[PDB]
């Protein structure tokens, strides 16, 4: 209420011009040249900045505020998605850690680095559920599961915002993209989203609510339609749900041009009408298109909006700044006047230890025939493929202020790990794509892919010569990071054809073949699963990726990563996800079942899958009783043993099924997990606790209750290989 | 009504056992052996039969009724989807005619032939909208468009049912599959359907309502969940919507095992609870699983259902029989006991002229380089491909009582056309698939695909020898009919790999290459569009298919067919459909940037759009003109264009009218079909086409499901496909 008092006294002093100026969020560029923008800040016409990311540049902008009548400070934002300068694995790789503390650490270090550069806010976490592998932005989320993504949503917010949003090493989380953005039809970015309310409430909305309940300060509004209404114009979504039902008290931010794009969506015929729809829906802050500054005065004078629409939006911007500590000290993240200057990109400001330890936890072992991995540091290892020496790709998409030249390649990680104990032989083998039109797409803004001027044939002949001179081949293959970014949707989920030709040529040498995969989405890997001797999924593993990958390949780290998104056998099976409905004719096999005829059915690799260099055993599942009273707790116990020869971690997963309900419920739903590190011969009793809240679902009328009757409890080391027992809720 | 008096006096006579017996719909099979079924009919324990399809067999079952206490007659049903004995093209090929009179004729002939064999009812039309090419049952529908499918839904019902459902040449339409069955997730048959209510009401439900409004006697309930609730247990769908809102007064029928499958869906833990959910939801008649007969008495005695649940279901069955004329004469479709026996499959009982004329109208010319088609009846023509001599495939899936040995193959149609004037050389070239697992699937239950035992290589060498000895190659390729049927969902939309290898080898001969495509779904044809010299889409063209295809190839018929479903460039683009939303960042010719709604690794848009199809002549359209720039509510607007045949051959095309509502309370489609005209023109002929548009054309369901037309701009597009249009605008006041 100090905050409410402070904001009400400030707003009672402000003109409408000053209130509207708070709603303007801009980036320096063609549309807002630096000197003109500086003059607007001085006039009180700017509320905040994004994409200005160094302390002297931010401090210069904050200095301009002292010229405005009320000297209301700016906040500065950036897309710190999975690292600021030190780049962690992409979020899909962090999720595969199954370890909230690992994910927390990446977020904390991101906030530490971003706040050290003067940033107040990140447009993160991204908590959109993804069941469609074709979407470019699957790399930005935590996979297909509502429970896990909801958990990590809360973890990311708490880790960014810390104990106090006014702390100089805290940043505000702007959770995105509200809402349902990863359900785009056809996996085409920005495309139509259409879904029932029970699916929306049960599966898609809970991660956004988890962020709000963790106290997220901001929400970034999505670019897509929800059931015909763009999120930027959706009063039900942004007012009724987010504010009135969920109690969100923070700031809504539009995406770039989102208010103007209501004209392309066909909700508005002109910019004046687009502005009215966005502010009355509940969008507080207008990114870059400047429609609010242009049209809000005219709309109010015409009685087309209410003073309360402006007041709500302005209070939310001021409340964000208040919580960030900026009214107490606008320079709290910008140090002192005549602090000595520093190199923003100095090696001494990176966190390589943390990036290497985090990156180890996300690597997923998918195949390991006859214990080929871990490798011994000996002999001659051929390192082949267009991603082996790529610094640009290892840091991934949404690499923020990450510097490619600071990153450790797979080749360099292997060189560092073996030193003089083994000989590495390098050949590029193929370009990332053989299709010049795809290479031109990827290099269209910036040179992001090195195109070897040699023929495909010459590169292959060199790679075969290299393979013949080696004891075994480490093929580093998959996507370049520009294939799994905003607007980069794919119609094919395989490794690119140029690289598959290389893999088929390398297989024909008879040399043991280890695949190191880099990719930002599930890939179709049927040929690789049949033909490679071992397969390690490394996503894009970040600044220290090459070192983390070498640590796993040589057995310094026993792989512990597990998939959080199902890998389809082909793009033609989309969508595939573990928490699907049974249907009336489930596939076991019979012709008259829910299936395809022209390919094997089910995912190639299921949700929760990942191998180890050791063996684990689970004892029989035991429940604390066969009947559960309302308000009572059920315990599900299992003993995990390391029955192999190497220390390692696995993830014990708990799944629930509600086999008779008022709605058809999923064949199983994740409801808990434990990541457990065990030395050989160690045993751990795992105790899962379940209550009524774990058993609730949204019915056809969106009643959120648990119905009496049977529940099935499954425990295992993936979604496919479980044991189950039942109990009855009374 | 005297009908409601008649039905109430009969129900006042009936025990609950008699009422519940009316709800039982069964087929002869392992689960219902013939003699046990006969004994059940005599006991009053059977309401209707399906899959008994000859006059003597139907007459024998109707004869059993005379032994029951009340002698209530059976009705007999079958899946007469696109023909009974004379098989027309599959429905997706009939829709490509764009001609309600052509579609009416196929349905009229179907009903004539089915009723002549004693059948009272067809489980048809199938009116499920299909936007996902992977689904096996796309072959059974009319494509992706709500307006077109809705129009043809009503045409099919009226054509089956005629002036009087008691007429001996009428059958009852059981419209299917209610509802949303073609929206299955992943295009996997029987899979989850999840969609918003505005999409449901605007795009998916209207064809079922068109069938109800045309007076369809029955509705067949679908197998899928709708937003979590199986259709068979969905009281909102079958009672609130179908009965209370739409006023449907007819019979609801479950699908095979659908009541029992509520256990697998996880709505019921046992058969007793599944039975309760189905009858209370509004399912009147139980197909095959016999749960109603087993459980309704126990449910009623326990107060778990109401007498009114049984009474509703029984009244609906009796009302169907009344309308069919079966209480007036149970033998009205079965002639007289004295009639001489006849051959059910006699040539004189077929309608080959109608099948040949209908089949010609559905063929779509997709490519014709440098006027290769039409062919001259001369020289040496190689006829190559696993579908060239296939009688089983030409009649399609859901071929009812069609006899493959009566069908005309593409090879036979070409032989019939050229007689002695040209030499045909045949080679199979490849099997339908090179994947043994796919062959195993296609020959499971019934052996439907002939496997040439030779290597792929030997078959190719034989086809290359044949091609080298000819002036040109007619390659007859695509899917077998078992690839586009119930449960046959595909993950690849290309021609099968064994056949694409054949086409690549044939291309390399340098011989002109004509592709004749058979298929039950849109195919991915990027290589074919680049490399074939001509491509003719023939779907599965039916009993006279091979003759209709020869008529088009030799120029006796100028191809007039147009696509009613978008052809994707690849399965990785699914779904692709013409009436999509713009998004905030459209990719189109006018919006070509990186940061648009697109894929980066393939050309964008469909390979062939909705409404696409070529001709052996050229057409021109005059400028579009509207009767005014402002439309008052209550008034109608006219949109006029002149069509000319500016080429050298007589032919038809389809003039298509689309609407856009560019500013609305909901994001509306970039265009929506709102009228069309198929026009046959001699060379140099012109026709003024007048489209009428009213407020009814402009309405949509908003977020609150209000059915509104909002004042403001509408754009009217006219053209010969959905990609090649021009527009004019008006303002609704
Ligand atoms: O937070 C992120 C936004 O910064 C991002 O905005 C994009 C920036 O580049 C522009 O050219 C694009 O047009 C624009 O959408 O969108 C994604 C969001 O996560
Ligand atoms: O009208 C058609 C039904 O008769 C058809 O029923 C099928 C009969 O064969 C069984 O093996 C199938 O399991 C069953 O669904 O289904 C589709 C409907 O259109
Ligand atoms: Mg239950
Ligand atoms: Mg409008």
Coordinates of C-alpha atoms in Angstrom, one line a residue, chain A residues 75-78 80 107-108 111 120-127 152-162 165 170-176 208 210-212 214-220 248 250-253 320 323-324 333:
Chain A
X75 CA 13.1 0.2 -17.5
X76 CA 15.3 -1.6 -20.0
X77 CA 14.3 -5.1 -21.4
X78 CA 15.9 -7.8 -23.4
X80 CA 17.4 -13.2 -22.1
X107 CA 18.0 -18.3 -14.9
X108 CA 19.9 -16.8 -11.8
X111 CA 19.7 -12.4 -14.4
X120 CA 15.8 -4.6 -15.6
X121 CA 13.6 -7.2 -17.4
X122 CA 13.7 -10.3 -19.6
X123 CA 11.1 -11.4 -22.1
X124 CA 11.3 -14.9 -20.5
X125 CA 10.4 -17.5 -19.5
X126 CA 8.7 -18.9 -22.6
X127 CA 6.2 -21.4 -21.2
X152 CA 9.8 -24.9 -14.6
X153 CA 7.7 -21.7 -15.4
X154 CA 7.5 -21.0 -11.6
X155 CA 11.2 -21.9 -11.1
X156 CA 12.3 -19.5 -13.9
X157 CA 10.3 -16.6 -12.5
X158 CA 11.5 -17.1 -8.9
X159 CA 15.1 -17.4 -10.1
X160 CA 15.0 -14.2 -12.2
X161 CA 13.1 -12.1 -9.6
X162 CA 14.8 -13.5 -6.4
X165 CA 12.6 -7.3 -7.4
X170 CA 17.1 -9.2 -9.8
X171 CA 15.3 -8.7 -13.1
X172 CA 11.5 -8.8 -13.8
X173 CA 10.2 -11.8 -15.7
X174 CA 7.8 -11.0 -18.6
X175 CA 6.3 -14.5 -19.1
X176 CA 5.5 -15.3 -22.8
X208 CA 1.0 -19.0 -17.5
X210 CA 2.1 -20.9 -12.6
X211 CA 4.2 -17.8 -13.6
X212 CA 1.5 -15.4 -12.3
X214 CA 5.2 -17.2 -8.7
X215 CA 4.7 -13.4 -8.9
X216 CA 5.8 -12.7 -12.5
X217 CA 5.8 -8.9 -12.9
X218 CA 4.9 -8.9 -16.6
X219 CA 3.2 -10.9 -19.3
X220 CA 4.0 -10.6 -23.0
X248 CA -2.6 -10.8 -12.0
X250 CA 1.4 -6.7 -13.2
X251 CA 2.1 -5.3 -16.6
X252 CA 0.9 -6.6 -20.1
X253 CA 3.3 -5.9 -23.0
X320 CA 6.5 -2.4 -12.5
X323 CA 8.8 -3.0 -7.7
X324 CA 12.1 -2.8 -9.8
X333 CA 21.6 -1.6 -11.7

